[PDB]
Amino acid sequence: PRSLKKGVFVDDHLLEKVLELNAKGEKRLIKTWSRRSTIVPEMVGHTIAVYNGKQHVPVYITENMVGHKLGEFAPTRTYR
Amino acid sequence: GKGDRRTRRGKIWRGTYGKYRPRK
Amino acid sequence: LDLALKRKYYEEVRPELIRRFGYQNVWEVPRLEKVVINQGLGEAKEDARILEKAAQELALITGQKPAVTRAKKSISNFKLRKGMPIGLRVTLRRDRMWIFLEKLLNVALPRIRDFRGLNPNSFDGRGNYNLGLREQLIFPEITYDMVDALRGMDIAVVTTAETDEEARALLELLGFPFRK
Amino acid sequence: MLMPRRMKYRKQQRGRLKGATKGGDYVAFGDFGLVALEPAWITAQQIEAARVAMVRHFRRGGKIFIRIFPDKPYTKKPLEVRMGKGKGNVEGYVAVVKPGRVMFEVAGVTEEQAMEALRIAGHKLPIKTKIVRRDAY
Amino acid sequence: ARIAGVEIPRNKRVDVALTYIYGIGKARAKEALEKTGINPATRVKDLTEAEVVRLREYVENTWKLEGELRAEVAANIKRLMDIGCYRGLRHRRGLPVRGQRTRTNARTRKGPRKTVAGKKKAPRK
RNA sequence: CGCCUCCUAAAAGGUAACGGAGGCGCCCAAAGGUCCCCUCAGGCGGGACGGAAAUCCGCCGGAGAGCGCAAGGGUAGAAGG
RNA sequence: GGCGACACACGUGCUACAAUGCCCACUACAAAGCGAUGCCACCCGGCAACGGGGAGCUAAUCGCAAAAAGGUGGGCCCAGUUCGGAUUGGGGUCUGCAACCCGACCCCAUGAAGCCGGAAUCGCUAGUAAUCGCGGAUCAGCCAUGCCGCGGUGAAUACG
RNA sequence: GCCCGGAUAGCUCAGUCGGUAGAGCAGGGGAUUGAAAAUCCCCGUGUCCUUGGUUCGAUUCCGAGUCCGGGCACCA
RNA sequence: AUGUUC
């Protein structure tokens, strides 16, 4: 259903980031503090961090994740 | 069914207008 | 009869083959060989009679009465004590296998359990091919027919087919698509 | 560790007696050959008692060819007079042995380890040996 | 009788066999009768052969489904474990790829149960 | 403790010892007279319910199949199906 | 990230065990509420949700609201079924700036289960049981099937 | 070490003639009780000594030994 | 008519 037409949701800084890469070049990979935002193409492969509330859980971002978001590929919570 | 939709025995114990509650 | 395959291959397949490949002798080209029909289940003396129930419909269904193969012994048997029959069989080369199939093919086929695909890969490597099954009414002259009945079956085929090269050749020849 | 046995998968019946086949064996498949002396039926034991010392006396390692096989264990009725059965069964297996018959062929180590190899191997037993050469390969 | 891969339905009125199929969204049905009108009040048995046919290929050709329903089945789930989705460790672990509760009911992917034990002297409530 | 196949047994035939490894004291009306008929085990693969093994066809492969029940010989110009 | 962790044991609520169960065009009737920056008439796009848009009352004329449980005609033939919801995929939605963990839905497809549960342990002597519903608080928007509150129906039975 | 007889699940033991394996207990858990013991309820954990045979089939016909019990070893 | 514990 993917609701919220446009304007959906993203931050500010993070963008200043991608654009850099999609400007000066792909350069080096990166990292992140918290979480909560949708996915796009211009950024994929270009993996980075995703410090899950407990310990770092970054995703070598890809395309399977077409236009989904971070919700599904944001692993955490004990087990085994 | 009781816990089932697309009728009224559900739309009642749930709260859901939809194409199943307008008028004209 | 004097319809499809007839003035088909025998006036059309040939005039194609021609340049559509470099052939030599006639009785040594993508000719033909035989039409094989066979079946098996797993049950034996369930009463010994049910067994003849199949015996009833089946064979005549095609339009031919074949030879039998039932029983072996009241032994343990690894894959069931069953008396140990097997099934039955028979074959043909006459127009019974002419118009007979014209129908079962262009008709029974596509009303398949999932159209938009054909198995031209269950091939061997020569005029040897094989495709199992598990239908019944799908037949043209036998649509529905014997609900009280019900069972599985299977088929085999033979041609010169140096390999499935002559096999698949017949494939697109008059249908028999590629599973994709 | 390593306490098993070794003998034709299972049995192979239990019966035989002897000869002398005044020796045998051909060229070789390996290098510095080990040539026999004495004609007899041999023991799993004597075998092991040899490659041993050699091997560790072959620190970094060793290696040699092992031509032959097991054939018949034996009898030897433990006590009293003598009648039936076949004691001495799962007791001791013998390999077919011909006078001077070949037995082994070293490598990797030259007449430093290989010399003694044979000069200690033989010693391990009553009979002795010599080296390889050519003959045919 | 084959409006698609073997359409066994036969022995009643349209308003009898119908959607008891698998991939069945009663919508297009009121379309066979909407866009056109191949009504419901016709006993399958006599379901006018004219209706019969036009209905057959009606949704036999072009209309992908049934078998293709299975298609996505994999894509969704399978595509998730070939990748890196958490819901992915769900379907792939007998876990109901729905995302709801915890320790309260499984009967979604796997099912039933196998027990172990409890702290020596472990009560009930 | 009577007999059945091979070993021992030293190539005619025989050959012994509380020496090794196996057997029978039944069964058959059809497992029997008689005439036209196959092939095998099986390796390959093609191929619903078929993981060896459901089953079937083409290749090869002559007996290792196999022929009341032990072993042995004979044997597909089969006794043998 | 996290108490909305998972292999299994007790409870207490909502439903299938469906053919007095089935659905609809339509058509009939309670109390308690609760309305302010509040209940939104009503035309409609929309099959719909939503939303647009706009009056009342400026407040018991203006809102929730229509009804529900019925009537009826019109339509299945105990099949584990015009049964059933797990469930599984998505398409829009919507307060919250924003709902992956977990949001509440308009709408498309899915058929676990299961013919009433061992041994048991549960209310209640009159509207009594049982039943179909509507409004209270809380939360900004919520899975509150909560407990709160009110009724259009409405049986048994008790030697002792 | 002679022979006869002897190795089922946790273990106390069945299984006349082979082809859908038990009970007694056992323990598991629900239903108890204030709690607990006596229950009522329902189940599944065995390669029936490895290994080697017939038969299509072996827990039951066949050997091997690790072991298990009975009898076993006297004038001399 | 038969029934044990803290």
Curated annotation (Swiss-Prot), chain A:
> Mind listing the GO biological process terms from this record?
ribosomal small subunit assembly; translation
InterPro entries named among the record's database cross-references: Ribosomal_uS19, Ribosomal_uS19_bac-type, Ribosomal_uS19_CS, Ribosomal_uS19_SF
Pfam families membership: Ribosomal_S19 (PF00203)
- What are the alphabetically sorted keywords of the record? Ribonucleoprotein, Ribosomal protein, RNA-binding, rRNA-binding
Q: Could you cite one Gene Ontology molecular function of this protein?
A: structural constituent of ribosome
Q: Does the keyword Ribonucleoprotein apply?
A: yes
The cellular component terms of Gene Ontology attached to this UniProt record, alphabetical and capped at eight, are: cytoplasm; small ribosomal subunit
**Protein family:** Belongs to the universal ribosomal protein uS19 family.
Function, as annotated? Protein S19 forms a complex with S13 that binds strongly to the 16S ribosomal RNA.
HAMAP family linked: Ribosomal_uS19
The name this protein carries in UniProt is Small ribosomal subunit protein uS19
Q: Which organism is it from?
A: Thermus thermophilus (strain ATCC BAA-163 / DSM 7039 / HB27)
Curated annotation (Swiss-Prot), chain B:
Name a Pfam family for this protein: Thx
Give the protein family. Belongs to the bacterial ribosomal protein bTHX family.
- Where is this chain compositionally biased, Basic residues type? 1-12
Question: Region Disordered: which residues?
Answer: 1-24
Q: Which InterPro entries match?
A: Ribosomal_bTHX, Ribosomal_bTHX/bTHXc/bTHXm
| Keywords of the record | Ribonucleoprotein, Ribosomal protein, RNA-binding, rRNA-binding
What's the domain of life for this entry?
A: Bacteria
Q: What protein does this entry describe?
A: Small ribosomal subunit protein bTHX
List GO terms (cellular component aspect).
Answer: ribonucleoprotein complex; ribosome
UniProtKB/Swiss-Prot annotation, chain C:
Q: Which Gene3D superfamilies does the record associate with it?
A: 3.30.1440.10
Q: Name one GO cellular component term.
A: ribosome
Taken from the record, one Pfam family name reads: Ribosomal_L5
Q: Name one GO biological process term.
A: translation
InterPro entries, alphabetized = Ribosomal_uL5, Ribosomal_uL5_bac-type, Ribosomal_uL5_C, Ribosomal_uL5_CS, Ribosomal_uL5_dom_sf, Ribosomal_uL5_N
Gene Ontology terms, MF aspect: rRNA binding; structural constituent of ribosome; tRNA binding
Q: Hey, what's the signal peptide range on this chain?
A: none
Looking at the record's lineage, which domain of life comes first?
Answer: Bacteria
Which SUPFAM superfamilies is this protein grouped with? Answer: RL5-like
Q: Which UniProt keywords apply?
A: Ribonucleoprotein, Ribosomal protein, RNA-binding, rRNA-binding, tRNA-binding
* Protein family according to the UniProt entry: Belongs to the universal ribosomal protein uL5 family.
Q: How does it assemble?
A: Part of the 50S ribosomal subunit; part of the 5S rRNA/L5/L18/L25 subcomplex. Contacts the 5S rRNA and the P site tRNA. Forms a bridge to the 30S subunit in the 70S ribosome.
What does this protein do, in the record's words? This is one of the proteins that bind and probably mediate the attachment of the 5S RNA into the large ribosomal subunit, where it forms part of the central protuberance. In the 70S ribosome it contacts protein S13 of the 30S subunit (bridge B1b), connecting the 2 subunits; this bridge is implicated in subunit movement. Contacts the P site tRNA; the 5S rRNA and some of its associated proteins might help stabilize positioning of ribosome-bound tRNAs.
This one is known as Large ribosomal subunit protein uL5
Curated annotation (Swiss-Prot), chain E:
**What assembly does the database describe for this protein?**
Part of the 30S ribosomal subunit. Forms a loose heterodimer with protein S19. Forms two bridges to the 50S subunit in the 70S ribosome.
Q: Which HAMAP family does UniProt cross-reference here?
A: Ribosomal_uS13 (MF_01315)
- The organism encoding this protein is Thermus thermophilus (strain ATCC BAA-163 / DSM 7039 / HB27)
Name this protein carries in UniProt: Small ribosomal subunit protein uS13
The Gene Ontology terms for molecular function here are: rRNA binding; structural constituent of ribosome; tRNA binding
A GO biological-process term: translation
Q: Spell out the PROSITE patterns in the cross-references.
A: RIBOSOMAL_S13_1, RIBOSOMAL_S13_2
Per the entry, what this protein does is: Located at the top of the head of the 30S subunit, it contacts several helices of the 16S rRNA. In the 70S ribosome it contacts the 23S rRNA (bridge B1a) and protein L5 of the 50S subunit (bridge B1b), connecting the 2 subunits; these bridges are implicated in subunit movement. Contacts the tRNAs in the A and P-sites.
Annotated spans, Disordered: 94-125
Its GO CC terms? cytosol; small ribosomal subunit
User: Which UniProt key words apply to this protein?
Assistant: Ribonucleoprotein, Ribosomal protein, RNA-binding, rRNA-binding, tRNA-binding
Q: Which InterPro entries does the record associate with it?
A: Rbsml_uS13_C, Ribosomal_uS13, Ribosomal_uS13-like_H2TH, Ribosomal_uS13_bac-type, Ribosomal_uS13_CS
The entry sums up its family as follows:
Belongs to the universal ribosomal protein uS13 family.
